Amino acid sequence: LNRYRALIVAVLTVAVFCIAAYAIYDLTTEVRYDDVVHALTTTKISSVLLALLFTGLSFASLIFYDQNALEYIGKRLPFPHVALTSFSAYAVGNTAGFGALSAGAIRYRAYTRLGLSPDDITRVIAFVTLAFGLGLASVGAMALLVIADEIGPLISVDGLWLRLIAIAILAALAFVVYAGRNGREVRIGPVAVRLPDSRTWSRQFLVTAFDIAASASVLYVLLPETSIGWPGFFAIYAIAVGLGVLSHVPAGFGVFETIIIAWLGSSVNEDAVLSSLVLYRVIYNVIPLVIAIAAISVAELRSSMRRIGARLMPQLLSAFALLLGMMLVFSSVTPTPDHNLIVLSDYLPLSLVESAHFLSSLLGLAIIVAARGLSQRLDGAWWVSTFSALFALFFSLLKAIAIVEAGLLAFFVFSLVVSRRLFKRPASLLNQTLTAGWLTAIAVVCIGAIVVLFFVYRDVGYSNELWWQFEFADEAPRGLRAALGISIVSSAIAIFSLLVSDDAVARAVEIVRKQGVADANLVRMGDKSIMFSEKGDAFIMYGKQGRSWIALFDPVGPRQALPDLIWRFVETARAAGCRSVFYQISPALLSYCADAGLRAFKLGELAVVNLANFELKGGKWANLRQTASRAVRDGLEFAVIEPQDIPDVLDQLAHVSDTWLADHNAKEKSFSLGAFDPDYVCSQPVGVLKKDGKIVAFANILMTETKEEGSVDLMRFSPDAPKGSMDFLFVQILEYLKGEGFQRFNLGMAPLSGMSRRESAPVWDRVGGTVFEHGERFYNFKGLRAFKSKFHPEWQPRYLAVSGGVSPMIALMDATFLIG
Amino acid sequence: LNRYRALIVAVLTVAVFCIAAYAIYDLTTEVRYDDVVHALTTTKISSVLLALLFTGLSFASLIFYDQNALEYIGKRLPFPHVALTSFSAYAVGNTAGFGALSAGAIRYRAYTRLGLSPDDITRVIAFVTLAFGLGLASVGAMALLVIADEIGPLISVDGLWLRLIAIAILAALAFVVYAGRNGREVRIGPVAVRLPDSRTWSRQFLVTAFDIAASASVLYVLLPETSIGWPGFFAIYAIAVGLGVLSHVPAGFGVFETIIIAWLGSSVNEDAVLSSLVLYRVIYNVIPLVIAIAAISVAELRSSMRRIGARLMPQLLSAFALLLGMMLVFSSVTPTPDHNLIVLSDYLPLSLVESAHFLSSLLGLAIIVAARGLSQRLDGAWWVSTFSALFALFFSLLKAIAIVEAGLLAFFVFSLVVSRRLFKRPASLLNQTLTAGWLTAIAVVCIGAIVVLFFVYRDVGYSNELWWQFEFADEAPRGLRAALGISIVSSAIAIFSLLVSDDAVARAVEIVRKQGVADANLVRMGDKSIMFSEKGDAFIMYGKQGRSWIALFDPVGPRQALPDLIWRFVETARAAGCRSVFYQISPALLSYCADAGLRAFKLGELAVVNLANFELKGGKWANLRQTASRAVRDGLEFAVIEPQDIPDVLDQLAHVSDTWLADHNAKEKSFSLGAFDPDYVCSQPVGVLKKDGKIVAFANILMTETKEEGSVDLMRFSPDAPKGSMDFLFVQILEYLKGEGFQRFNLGMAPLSGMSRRESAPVWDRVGGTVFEHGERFYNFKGLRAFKSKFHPEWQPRYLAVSGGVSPMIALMDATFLIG
Ligand SMILES: CCCCCCCCCCCCCCCC(=O)OC[C@H](COP(=O)(O)OC[C@@H](O)COC(=O)[C@@H](N)CCCCN)OC(=O)CCCCCCCCCCCCCCC
Ligand SMILES: CCCCCCCCCCCCCCCC(=O)OC[C@H](COP(=O)(O)OC[C@@H](O)COC(=O)[C@@H](N)CCCCN)OC(=O)CCCCCCCCCCCCCCC
Ligand SMILES: CCCCCCCCCCCCCCCC(=O)OC[C@H](COP(=O)(O)OC[C@@H](O)COC(=O)[C@@H](N)CCCCN)OC(=O)CCCCCCCCCCCCCCC
Ligand SMILES: CCCCCCCCCCCCCCCCCC(=O)O[C@@H](COC(=O)CCCCCCCCCCCCCCC)COP(=O)(O)OC[C@H](O)CO
Ligand SMILES: CCCCCCCCCCCCCCCCCC(=O)O[C@@H](COC(=O)CCCCCCCCCCCCCCC)COP(=O)(O)OC[C@H](O)CO
């Protein structure tokens, strides 16, 4: 199932949007586009201003969503930063909720820039998401319970049934809250939700209820004085928003309008409802994006607001470009007023006007294609989107008057040229499998355009001669040609999207010795494809598995050459149509990974012992001294074999490794743990534990010339060894490394402690459990966490960075299979 | 103004109730009592069961009111105790909200039994009261904001005006919340409200909103399928409840019904609204009292629930008796069905039936008179109420069938005889000025009966021959005679309610020496009236001022003889028509004061130095050793003068006292501080500080034979003394007392520290400020708090107990005037 999870969820989303579009088309048979436009023109200025006010109130409540999340996890951040990240995250989530533009992605980027651990960012995202979903369910259930007899008749449903649905929902929520009184993680199968204390989720319930009330008030004020009061439309709006977010359609664009049109058909004229929905979409979705984009652009023109806005601009501009191209496509489909048509006919040629219409349509589709590249800071995407926006500005001033269209396009161009510096990546737009979410957006825009064409020109029949009509008489030929062009080019886009050595290892080892990370010596295994930097200074060892390029530890090389290497690895993985995965990265590289659109997830702690402060003849290692002394009394001796004179000992090294592999029912792992390749083990010094002449324990010592850090990859123990062989081998290797001039020693990886997992996300479902399972499977081959704690090391968190907003499940499983 | 505050507030409450009653009478001109009864009989059983369910839900939310208050102050109490005290407090507050039956009084009694400090009880009461009031204002304002256009037309008011009222209220509340972000006590003139943190008041807002929703749902379900939805009636109900609680009428009995009748006149037939209001009053007010009373009675029949219910039973029974007598009066006014009338005529004599009607009316009035005595655990009140209830049971089975009336009366008798033990006090019902609140209740019941008579027999004219009609034809003669009897007897009740030595001091001093409280020696001043115990073992020194018998320190004498003395003092003060006040009582007597209906308020801390652990040659008194040594180097010497050889030194004792009184611009206080009476000072040993032959400082040493504790009353310092005379005199007296065999020494009283006042009530208005002002005025004549802290004493809180639920302002001011 998860082999095609993205494809199946995208197909289901497009199918649900198709059902919604058909429902709107069927429910608006008596509504004509002229009636919709007349309702739009007759809307009161008071209504629009009051809708703007309630949009502002809703987004303030969203700011407090994020504020409450940060307060719950304990972190304190300055209010301008939290307000800006919350406003941007919600302005993009309410518009484009798929992978790179989800509110979670915005929050991760901004909070990583703001100085939050990935666990803290995950906790904030989980708190906010569970808050919105659960509070929306609760508020909708209470509103439905209140007014089932007032809004039930509108859809010819008895109020008792809606009341019972609301009661069932409220009973489920009450059972969840009561079963999760004080901690006490309740499991509903895969998910394991741990609700906050009553005070926190109570304040969050006020925040979420006020948010939903303000948004419903936006749309209600934009409605033309209906018969149902505010509570009625509020429950209707809560149900519609719940269904829209549950359908995974971007912004719920189909389902929300479908539900509201289907519901208010009897109460309000559907042309007025459609005009109100159009104006609500415009205000509540475009105006926040325009406000955020303009604020950041002005801050760039003229403190820390500038830096956080620079971090957030690529995604805000990607969302705005998606909306802008959607606008261009829809405006191509919808007809120009006759007055504007005759005005342009008085000045412009016919062929120029028709070509401008078709090109504006195709340029809108090109803009929503290049929006993904804008989200990735692509220089080519900046050029394509800038020129497409400028040409569409001109072609909208030509194919019509398009005052607001031209204003929006010019504002996009302004914000795009003001933020030029942020788009410098050299990857190519047309060399990438786009996304399940991005093809979902393309398909939604295209099908919406087709349905809008069928709705606008429903009265006019489909004549085969309508294709070639040109003489300004009607834009049905123009709309039909634009829709055909959109369909063809989008199908082309979808079709296009769905259609080692020895010197490398040598240079990698040269780089490894030139730097100070001992674990980089795993490149010698030869099973990792090596990706070198542009200068060759740094490299990224990686292995390909499934649909992911699972990179190993941090890019190895000079410090300043690492961010560009991370960017280049991610872009190259996308070029091969794969999602880049960084396995076991240090916290130092999280910000650079975050810029590359990679979200990190903690999967263990790397035990580091500082050899400068390690003196075994001290009180901090009493159990260690006892175990070492008893091992000495058992007859074990430790020697360091140089890599050149190994093989005569390598033969029974293979013997002891095979015996230890037989002793514990485990296979030979790779790509992250020691694999007994005779050349690999020969290439490095091997600390070996010898007893009674024969050797019973050995451990590949990982070293670097700079002597910043040393480590051990694999160690094996024959049953002839005593129980303290592990402790004695570690102590001897650590002492040898300290004597030789090493600052720190890497004990390896350990799974996260239970106390660390206690402060976990409110709504994480399987990520924590699968991280724990992976840690148990792979990190216990070199001593348990208690054993490594016996050395009193400096625990360093290690993270798993995944790309494209994909789930940690699939990347973690791909890494698990690559190791196994 | 405060000289007659109780009278003016009672008169205003009765006037507001009269306006409300006239409004109901004017709004129900077209409604006949037969229509009301028909609507009552035709109510659906489903409606009644669902109203019971929502009453239960509302009272659960009230339990959580008190739970949230206790959580906010930090105290943890077992849930059964909190639930029982909250249920009882709200069942009585929703019915009889005046002095002895307010929810605050119930909470103080129960929480004192549960082990809460009076400051903690004050904080809980303030949190709960501010929660209800502020949350009701907020929820009503939001509901009105939502539906001003849906409920505005019902009273012919434009929705814009109700919306603007709601917006003004919400703006005021938002300004208060924002101005009180983190602590930051906001002052609105007299009051100083410090809102809790957002999480606490958010959970409390959910609790209060659910409470109001459940109560509004009770009444809405009891309504007959109106045209306005639940939000409409909910805002109407919130406004009605706000006005009812704001009018101080018991249970809002007039104003709530007035508002709802006036509002729903157009939507619903007013006979149906009146029936719904009657049934809502019955359910939501009687059923909780019946439930609590029955639960406690069963617990008495068959663990700690029994003890807390025994504590709460007198007040629950007083509230139930008030409702029961109200029922009896109303049933006397309202007519019996003709079928029951002919059934009783078939078996009973005419004169017996008419006498039973009149006597049932007068017995209901007698029951609501004896309810106050029941609240005071009076044995005579138990007898009067029991016999009145039994005779009214029989007279209701005689004057009518009265199945529910007889059931309620029999249940009252059952609960009254089951809880017989609790009513043992020997005071007299008819020897007390009743209360402003109790005359308010009497007047409300009487005026309601008069208006119900005018409403039932509005169609029938007022014929002078209606007085003497007797032959079962109609109960208009019976109702008119009963109403006249009620009016006459209530006027009689209101008219009736509004219409030292040397051997005593000798016996008081004998008791003082026989016990171990040194401060009891203030009785020797002779200005305190002395009230001895029945055996004469113990006494209460007290002084009368204003309308209060301001008792001094704890009753002096044997430990077990004190509770009865406290009870007897309170009862005697009520007999003289005065509110007993206990000044500076120890925490040990709070529970006994709480049983006597006295609520304590902390007014300072009494500094106690344990002489057993006091060794001046230790590090704990370095500043003391330095000051004593410097005073010695200044030439001051300390001597102890026995009480018999004083006067030769008393002459310049008067000299030095006069000089010190002149030095500090203060007068000669009394009743709590040292007054220079030559006999008084002669009667006790006087530690005197002599320098260069003359004496410059002296201090009346207060002693007891049992040597449990010693103290000092007044000390004076001529300007010839140095700055350390106070310290040296205290140190010398303390050392002398320790040597003579005293366990502890009383430094005196100090005002509360600022840190102590930081954990103050959310909504206390003037009590804290006036307590601080009184402490500053009176407790700084013997060294400041820092000075007394230089001795490192054991701070003991001292409380001010006031009676009858009167405000601490007036009792504290009376004490201030008595001292000055
Ligand atoms: C009736 C419900 C009972 C159970 C039904 C089935 C259960 C299945 C459980 C599925 C779990 C999650 C699935 C995918 C959710 C997801 O992937 O997202 C997470 C989202 C936060 O998302 P996010 O935090 O990122 O952003 C939020 C904002 O931006 C997006 O809203 C917009 O689009 C804006 N345009 C409008 C908002 C305006 C506010 N200013 O939370 C959720 O799970 C949502 C769950 C909601 C559940 C349905 C609510 C039903 C209403 C109650 C009435 C019931 C009556 C039913 C009768 C038919
Ligand atoms: C299932 C799918 C089918 C659809 C169902 C949904 C129902 C509706 C939902 C909302 C759709 C709206 C989209 C349409 C936008 C568009 O067609 O634009 C055109 C307009 C003006 O354009 P134009 O300038 O050319 O008109 C000329 C004028 O200005 C000059 O006339 C004057 O001034 C007057 N004096 C003359 C009066 C003459 C009278 N005869 O744009 C706007 O409304 C504002 C710009 C914002 C548009 C962006 C919309 C995107 C929001 C959607 C969010 C969902 C996100 C999903 C992502 C996948
Ligand atoms: C519109 C308001 C704005 C300002 C108006 C004037 C301000 C004056 C301020 C006066 C301060 C206090 C005065 C005396 C209050 C008092 O002495 O008491 C304290 C009580 C808790 O009392 P308590 O805790 O003891 O018990 C509670 C329960 O038992 C009693 O309720 C019952 O009787 C039950 N039968 C029914 C309850 C069912 C629940 N289960 O809180 C308060 O201050 C109350 C203040 C309320 C303010 C008015 C609310 C207005 C609604 C908003 C809509 C406005 C529209 C206006 C249009 C005209
Ligand atoms: C992450 C966000 C999640 C938001 C979820 C919102 C869900 C709201 C609707 C469901 C609420 C069901 C509550 C039913 C009671 C269950 C028992 C219970 O919860 O007991 C808790 C206490 O229960 C409550 O206090 C409940 C308060 C709310 C009561 C229900 C209100 C529902 C909403 C009513 C709105 C009505 C409005 C009408 C007028 C507009 C125990 O609390 P604790 O000990 O965990 O608290 C620890 C403390 O915080 C530490 O400081
Ligand atoms: C003692 C009980 C008092 C109850 C009072 C209830 C009043 C509710 C109505 C008025 C609310 C006005 C709030 C306006 C915002 C003012 C700014 C503000 O309050 O900032 C605070 C934060 O503001 C908020 O979070 C406000 C949350 C609620 C937002 C407003 C909701 C109003 C109710 C809407 C219901 C809508 C329902 C419609 C559908 C039914 C700061 O909090 P803090 O730092 O003091 O918190 C400390 C923390 O708790 C320590 O742990």
Residue numbers in the entry:
A (entry chain A), B (entry chain B): 24 to 325, 334 to 530, 540 to 860
Provide the authors' original text about this structure.
As a large family of membrane proteins crucial for bacterial physiology and virulence, the Multiple Peptide Resistance Factors (MprFs) utilize two separate domains to synthesize and translocate aminoacyl phospholipids to the outer leaflets of bacterial membranes. The function of MprFs enables Staphylococcus aureus and other pathogenic bacteria to acquire resistance to daptomycin and cationic antimicrobial peptides. Here we present cryo-electron microscopy structures of MprF homodimer from Rhizobium tropici (RtMprF) at two different states in complex with lysyl-phosphatidylglycerol (LysPG). RtMprF contains a membrane-embedded lipid-flippase domain with two deep cavities opening toward the inner and outer leaflets of the membrane respectively.
The cryo-EM map of RtMprF(GDN)-nanodiscs exhibits well-defined features allowing construction of a structural model with ∼94.4% amino acid residues of the full-length RtMprF protein and identification of four lipid molecules per monomer. Strikingly, one LysPG molecule each (LysPG1 and LysPG2) is trapped in Cavities C and P of the RtMprF(GDN)-nanodisc structure. The LysPG1 molecule in Cavity C has the characteristic hook-shaped polar head group inserted deeply toward the center of Subdomain 1, while the hydrophobic fatty-acyl chains of LysPG1 extend outwardly to the inner leaflet of lipid bilayer. Unlike LysPG1, LysPG2 located in Cavity P has an extended conformation. Its head group is positioned on the periplasmic surface and both fatty-acyl chains extend deep into the cavity toward the center of Subdomain 1. The backbone glycerol-3-phosphate group of LysPG2 may bind to adjacent residues through hydrogen bonds, whereas the fatty-acyl chains form van der Waals and hydrophobic interactions with nearby residues including Arg304, Phe276, and several other hydrophobic residues. Such a well-resolved lipid feature found in Cavity P is only present in RtMprF(GDN)-nanodisc but not in RtMprF(DDM)-nanodisc. By superposing them, it is apparent that TM12 moves 2.2 Å closer to TM11 and TM14 moves 4.2 Å closer to TM9 upon binding of LysPG2 in Cavity P. Besides, the amino acid residues involved in binding the fatty-acyl chains of LysPG2 are also adjusted slightly. In comparison, the LysPG:protein stoichiometry of the RtMprF(GDN) sample is ∼2.6, much higher than the LysPG:protein stoichiometry of the RtMprF(DDM) sample. Such difference may account for the strong phospholipid density in Cavity P of RtMprF(GDN)-nanodisc due to higher occupancy of LysPG, consistent with the interpretation of the lipid as LysPG2. A second molecule of LysPG may further enter Cavity C, so that Cavities C and P are both loaded with LysPG as observed in the RtMprF(GDN)-nanodisc structure (State 5).
